[PDB]
């Protein structure tokens, strides 16, 4: 479908600074990120939900608090993550991440924004 095609159009991402995560991005940042998602051709059916899930207030339990994120850091390496074009941000899609639990990813996915250290594989 339209979702899988978009996901496969994106480049695999490597997060090298988990400690650089921005868990409470402001609206201006969220709009900029959303723009890049839309411009990458993110389907209208999921784009709004992914951007909702770019903030800790909508992240699953395994990511929800700073304390949890510090504890779980070593498990985050196992995420299958795609690069949001031109940004220090990734998408983690539920379809790629069934091996991670429902407390690590929910449908349709989530967005993590970083200060730095996001690379391609």
């Amino acid at each position: 479908n339209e979702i899988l095609e978009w996901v496969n159009s994106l480049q695999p991402a490597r997060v090298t600074r988990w400690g650089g995560m921005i868990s409470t991005p402001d609206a201006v940042l969220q709009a900029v990120i959303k723009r890049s998602l839309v411009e990458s051709g993110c389907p209208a059916s999921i784009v709004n939900e992914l951007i909702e899930n770019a903030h800790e207030r909508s992240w699953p339990q395994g990511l929800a608090t700073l304390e949890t994120r510090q504890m779980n850091r070593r498990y985050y390496e196992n995420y299958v993550a795609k690069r949001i074009p031109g940004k220090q941000a990734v998408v983690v899609m539920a379809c790629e991440n069934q091996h991670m639990g429902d407390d690590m990813v929910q449908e349709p996915g989530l967005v993590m924004i970083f200060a730095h250290g996001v690379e391609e594989i």
Partner: protein, 136 residues
């Protein structure tokens, strides 16, 4: 008051007897180029007049938030930028904005002591004590 010299800060850092957080309010890239060992980046970009401690916190990466939330645990919070001293904390100034967020406006965390401004800033520190700095 509200001040500390480089000598007094060096003595504090070398005598690990007193707890301290050093907050560097220079630009992101300036911090990355060179900063005081173990100092916290509260970048110029994350600071404007009238902002609250928690507004600053929301703009910080995870690792920086950990230190920010622990600011009430330590005896002293030391503030620095490139060139400023405690005399230079006028309205609109980055260090004045940071200090007011830490010590004047509404915050869940009360500091144990008034924040201290490093006299001469990072310019003076670099020349006095470059071995307590990230690049060699």
């Amino acid at each position: 008051s509200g001040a500390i010299t480089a000598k007094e800060l060096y003595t504090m850092m070398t005598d690990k007897n007193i707890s301290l957080i050093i907050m560097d309010a220079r630009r992101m890239q300036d911090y990355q180029d060179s900063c005081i060992l173990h100092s916290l980046s509260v970048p110029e970009e994350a600071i404007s007049p009238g902002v609250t401690a928690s507004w600053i916190e929301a703009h910080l990466p995870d690792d920086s938030k950990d230190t920010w939330k622990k600011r009430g645990n330590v005896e002293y919070v030391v503030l620095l930028d490139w060139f400023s001293s405690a005399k230079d904390l006028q309205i609109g100034t980055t260090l004045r904005s940071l200090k007011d967020a830490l010590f004047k406006w509404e915050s869940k965390t009360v500091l144990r002591n008034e924040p201290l401004v490093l006299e001469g800033g990072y310019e003076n520190w670099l020349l006095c004590y470059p071995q307590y700095t990230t690049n060699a």
